[PDB]
């Protein structure tokens, strides 16, 4: 424990981000990690000297939201998770854990990229070599990893050539999966403000990637099993500008009983306020309305609601009363709302409520 001393004359305000110290790895050969041995760290940086090791991840249940293996791999590649910095590439994977939440672990590798393209500040070389990666990806890949293109997951096997190829493909397509961005001056006219209509429906399948920069990447697939076409929602710089954004998004999800249910979504910080309305589905002039929310906790980066196993019936009164009840125990959603309130209190720089 470490004690920091502050003057008691004024009010004390702290804005800080906590990042785990990376773990340096330099051994080579058959490197098998037990469950906690890869559960503990957050960043692992690998700097090969002569060769590269073969990572083995036993009892590593890969986090997947899509049953098909060709669509959900792209989900990370669309929720967003694979970064290139010079010669290092970082890939973030997630695992399922017994206690609530979803685990995380980032693998950072050097030396995969050869020495010919050491000018990563220039994108022309990458653009020219993009077609080559489709045909012969191994050519630009150092031989030391030609024998380490697989990851062991216990009962499954993970491939990186496909992620690299599809990441290049989506980067080319940006300059597939469709994107809907939101801004202050975009959106048609309790949640008063702007309204945005999704072009095509989504399922109970919904998700929230929290970019550290402050960009929201909400995941919305297709509600159509025989081809999966998900749709990404972009909220740039919402973390520091959430009050300038007064837009919420409406969707119409079909049900198995040939019934259309409306779902209207608003975001309050990382609080995902979802309102489900039957729209005269079973009642008369008084449709039942369900309110739900989730909040990133301990600074999570990936989080949402299967909406098939997690959920409970809450009317307005029961909802906000249970909110105060857990607020006795420091409700996470109310905590983050108040905490973002303090954050937005200094947008102009000085404590003044806009």
UniProtKB/TrEMBL annotation:
Domain of life: Bacteria
Residues annotated as signal peptide: none
Protein name: Lymphostatin
Native source species: Escherichia coli
Part of the full-length chain shown: 2709 to 3095 of 3223
């Amino acid at each position: 424990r470490l004690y920091l001393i502050f003057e008691g004359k004024n009010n004390v305000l702290l804005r800080s981000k906590v990042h785990a110290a990376p773990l340096k790895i330099t051994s080579a050969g058959e490197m098998q990690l037990s469950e906690r041995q890869w559960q503990q760290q957050e960043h692992i940086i690998v700097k090969p000297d002569n060769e590269a090791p073969s990572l083995i991840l036993s009892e590593f249940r890969r986090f997947t939201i899509s049953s098909d293996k060709t669509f959900s791999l792209k989900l990370m590649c669309h929720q967003g998770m694979v970064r290139i910095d010079r010669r290092s590439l970082s890939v973030r994977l997630f695992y399922l854990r017994e206690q609530p939440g979803i685990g995380s672990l980032r693998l950072t590798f050097r030396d995969f990229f050869t020495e010919v393209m050491d000018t990563t500040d220039r994108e022309i070389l990458e653009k020219e070599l993009r077609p080559i990666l489709i045909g012969d990806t191994h050519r630009f890949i150092n031989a030391a990893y030609k024998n380490h293109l697989n990851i062991q997951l216990g009962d499954g096997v993970l491939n990186l050539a496909d992620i690299v190829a599809e990441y290049a493909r989506i980067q080319k397509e940006e300059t597939a999966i469709m994107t809907t961005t939101v801004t202050t001056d975009s959106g048609e006219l309790d949640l008063s403000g702007r309204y945005k209509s999704v072009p095509m429906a989504r399922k109970a399948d919904t998700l929230y990637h929290l970019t550290p920069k402050g960009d929201l990447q909400i995941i919305y697939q297709v509600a159509t099993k025989m081809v999966n076409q998900a749709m990404i929602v972009s909220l740039p710089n919402y973390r520091h500008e959430w009050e300038k954004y007064n837009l919420s998004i409406l969707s119409e999800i079909p049900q198995n009983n040939n019934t259309v249910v409306h779902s209207i979504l608003r975001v309050n910080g990382p609080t995902m306020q979802v309102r489900t309305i039957d729209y005269r589905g079973t009642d008369e002039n008084n449709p039942i309305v369900s309110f739900s929310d989730t909040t990133f906790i301990n600074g999570e980066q990936m989080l949402s609601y299967d909406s098939h196993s997690s959920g409970r019936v809450y009317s307005r009164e029961e909802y906000m009363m249970w909110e105060l009840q857990q607020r006795v125990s420091e409700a996470s959603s109310a905590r983050t709302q108040d905490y973002w309130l303090m954050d937005a209190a200094v947008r102009n720089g000085e404590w003044k409520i806009t």
